[model samples]
Target: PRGLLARVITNVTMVILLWAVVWSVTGSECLPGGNLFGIIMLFYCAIIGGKLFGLIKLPTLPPLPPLLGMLLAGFLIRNVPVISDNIQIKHKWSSALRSIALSVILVRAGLGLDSNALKKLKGVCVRLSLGPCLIEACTSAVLAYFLMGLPWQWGFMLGFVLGAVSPAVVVPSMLLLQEGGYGVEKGIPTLLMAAGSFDDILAITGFNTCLGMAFFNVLKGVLEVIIGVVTGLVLGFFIQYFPSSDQDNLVWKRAFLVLGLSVLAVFSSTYFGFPGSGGLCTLVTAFLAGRGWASTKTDVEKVIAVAWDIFQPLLFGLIGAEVLITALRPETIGLCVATLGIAVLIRILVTYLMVCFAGFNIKEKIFISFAWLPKATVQAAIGSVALDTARSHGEKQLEGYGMDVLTVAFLSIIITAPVGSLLIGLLGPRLLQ
Candidate 1:
């Protein structure tokens, strides 16, 4: 009887799993599996890769936790067939997790504000945050267009997408600088992280503006752009003011409210027809919550820690979903190289300007840029989406458009994301010191 029951259970489980795959994929299974399944395969790879990479101890590996370690490994393997054969399936799962989990992490990031830090940087923060980012965006736009040979519309699209530096790389450097006993040097990365986050939000907005302008008229769409940011600012204040608490246990209280609000803000706005507006709002609302959290109470650390852990796999999964091995092309490779060069140079310029504006010495600013150079999620996804959008709306043939460039962006991200994080983990102390 026991043996029979075991057989029955295994068969039942397989049947259910098969049914789900069939139900989701319909006629398109195998490589072209369901739209949602891509997300799953993405996370599955990350979880597996995390374990694999954790084994090889590299002195240069960043101090990122096992989860991050796993992801870097996952991305490395995700590109190869022997490892990635089932990658499509894993990607779907990973994407699903991200859809449900990552937003919460972002909110928690907002809520994880070190109030003391903000107060310390008050005057310096303003100049540091805006100056470098603005200059970088404008400068990169020119380089991307003329020197790199991208079309005007595409150039700005690339410009806006590449302008912001990755906080994934910057934040840890800040923490390490502080924790690793680097003293005042730690403040350098933190300042860059804060400003970089805001700059990313600005860059995303600029991408949309340029997309609309080259597609239509920037002047006409200017109102909507400003409105979106303002709306986000207001929403941020609302979440900051009404953060979940004991008495205010709204619905799924405790740690879930941040997740709920973040999702609802991004999705509801989209459901109502606000396109990229929700992202801008999400960033602002998140930033305000991060800033405002100085006064709130909750298991801030544990909750965010959980959120990040849960979200990392999913984030990595989304990273995989963007992978298309067949799209590599020669001209596209050229553009991708240019995009990377422009991104790095502009970030360096931004960093130096930030140093001057914030009264930091030249050496300190150079160190900050080194930590700030990696660009990840927003850039890769936004670039993919932008190219797809262009193909859909443009008069040109879809096959002739930006597919090659899109693939190049993917490869570049796959190569750089982990490398950037690792650099910060290893060299940040020396440069910062």
Candidate 2:
């Protein structure tokens, strides 16, 4: 206890000193400024807030993830009058940071996958990945048209926007469960991790297709899938032999190579207009590379996990910062909530049914349904695309639809991120055994 107290005091002092130095250098004028300094400060604030919130415990409830706190901290920074006035983050910075963080998580997921388990769960993985996403997209498209009064195409776009299950929230939670041996035997976590990647791809493809209905390229979506898979396979196999496994400090070197290449895969894919392919490439690369580097896999995983610790706060914090509570339209908020609720409800039901014959018990199926609830990273990234596109094209009618989509996407993130995370943390042990 004494040692713990000493460490806490030291940490507090360090934070204060760091803040003082930054303030002295930048002053109040630069506080709200965008760029590297602002990002660093925001990250610092988020980490402190996340750590503080990680300590809270309610009566009989499970311990909340620090991520929730980081998220809320970001929200407060953006929404609270004083703080929001003093801090402004650039969109490009946050988006890139989130993407990098995403790559980190995907790499971890790939490296941890069990080949034998995945083989056994192959059929179920396919259904779980494709079924709920497509069903939810269609259901939401219809609901948005009727409930939100969007046109058919725009409604489908909204559907796809909301259709993605948040890999950001799901992956880390599953990793925790996997580590604890919660559902590893049946490869439940692995199944979800694998399926969640494809789920995002389908959602993005459908959204892109609807967004460009005028020049809808049927082959574009298929191309993204092929590119993603092929890139991942080639990179994965290449990485296995490059480091040669005989170098001194091989583990650290391999970890650096893996992370660097994974980030490159994501950024390069996005640069080439195949953003969806980047994630797949990263996942496949890490998995294939991991298979060959089995001896150093665990060590490399540990290194990447530390990287996640830093990036996780930035990712969640930035996600929270995206929500502007006052920007929500009071008039349409009710209908928007209704649309989201119905679509998610139907999604849960469909997800449950998809895994029915996958050898899981009732509890496992239900748990899987609930596990598919969060929506953060993807929503934040693409939520504004419609709005931006509408403005660029000077389509007044589509602009309103874009606003509505953004509002709903924000709503989905704020509501589901915490709730989904808590449900997973609370229910995984009880149901998955």
Candidate 3:
């Protein structure tokens, strides 16, 4: 009883402290203003903001995840006009930071990959990766055009933006189940993780294609994906010769070497066209190279995880911070919700069809369909691509539509991420037997 009482007291104190800090900053310009100060506050709020959510738990709760809280934390901060106005980081800086977070998570995805499982389930993986993504993208595009009154190109862009399942959310959840032997016999979790990664690649590639067509640069989009693929293949082939070491310092060296190469690949892939494709190049290269190398230099994956852990909260918080709820007109809210709901239904159906014949029991198949509903990492990372394009090109008409794109993107993330997480968490044990 004493221990429980102490814990309760601590949580209450934390809540009070976080509330005080936020209130102080927003009520007056008590905080210093700069990129440095801004980053500090952002990270602090993210860390405590997650805890604050945990503090309010009811006894009946079933281990609810902190992601929802982290998101709400950022939303709260950004909605406060004074804090958002004063503690601002430049757009370029935030984008880069988000990119690094994305890169780290993707690299971790590559590292977590089970190559043997992938090869064994190649057919299922391929179907899962391509089928639902293509179906959802097309379906969403049509709905966006007819219902939302968006231009064809803009509709397609929104379709692809929301199409990708967030590897950041899916992969970690799958890993936990894999460790516990849930769905391990059929390699179900492994297949989903691999498919989730590839699905993002397709969605992002398609999004870039639509964006290029919007700007009359179709060839550039195709070449960007092509170059990224080629770069990944070439890097994969060559990194096979890279040395690994059991030596303490040398392990760190090799890890840095791999990180350096991956970052460079990401940078070079950008000039070819799609920046997100560059991140894909890094993911593919890391996976392929790690597969071929005589020794698995898992040390590098550690470095990647460290980066991801530090940045995960920051990334999610920023995602919420980007949402301008005021921009969501009430009339359009119903349309946005309808479009998202219908498209998601289509995605779930396509996913179920693709895996129905994959040698799984009905229960396992149902689980896969639910597992793929998440939308985050990619959505948060590239959700605003269209908006950025409009801003850079000074497309006046597109600017408003771009805002709509962001609003819908945020809504998708809000609706899907936690629910998907919950579905996967609760269903994994019950269905995977």
- Cα RMSD (Å) per model? 6.7, 2.4, 4.9
Candidate 1 vs candidate 3, lDDT winner: 3
- Of 1 and 2, the candidate ahead on lDDT is 2
Query: Which runs of model 2 end up more than 4 angstroms from their true locations?
Result: 16-34, 57-59, 182-184, 325-328
What residue pairs are clashing in model 3?
Answer: none
Q: Quickly count the clashes in candidate 3.
A: 0
| lDDT (10s digit) by residue, model 2, range 140-170 | 8788777767878787888888888888888
Candidate 1 vs candidate 3, TM-score winner: 3
Best model per TM-score: 2
Q: Kindly give the stretch of ten consecutive residues in candidate 2 with the minimal lDDT sum.
A: 29-38
Predictions in order: lDDT:
0.57, 0.80, 0.74
Q: After best superposition, candidate 3 residue 226: deviation in angstroms?
A: 4.4
Tell me the tens digit of each residue's lDDT in model 1 across 1-433. 6898988698668655854775565655424345444444555556656655545653453554343555455455556656555444443454445445535544544444455666578777677666656676676667766655466666666656655565544554454455466556435544554555555456666777776676544443454457568877766666655545555543335345556666876667556754445544555666666665554434455656655665666666455444544423355466656656666666676666655664555566666666666666666657666566656775565334356446545655665666676666667556646
* Order of the predicted models by lDDT, top scorer first: 2, 3, 1
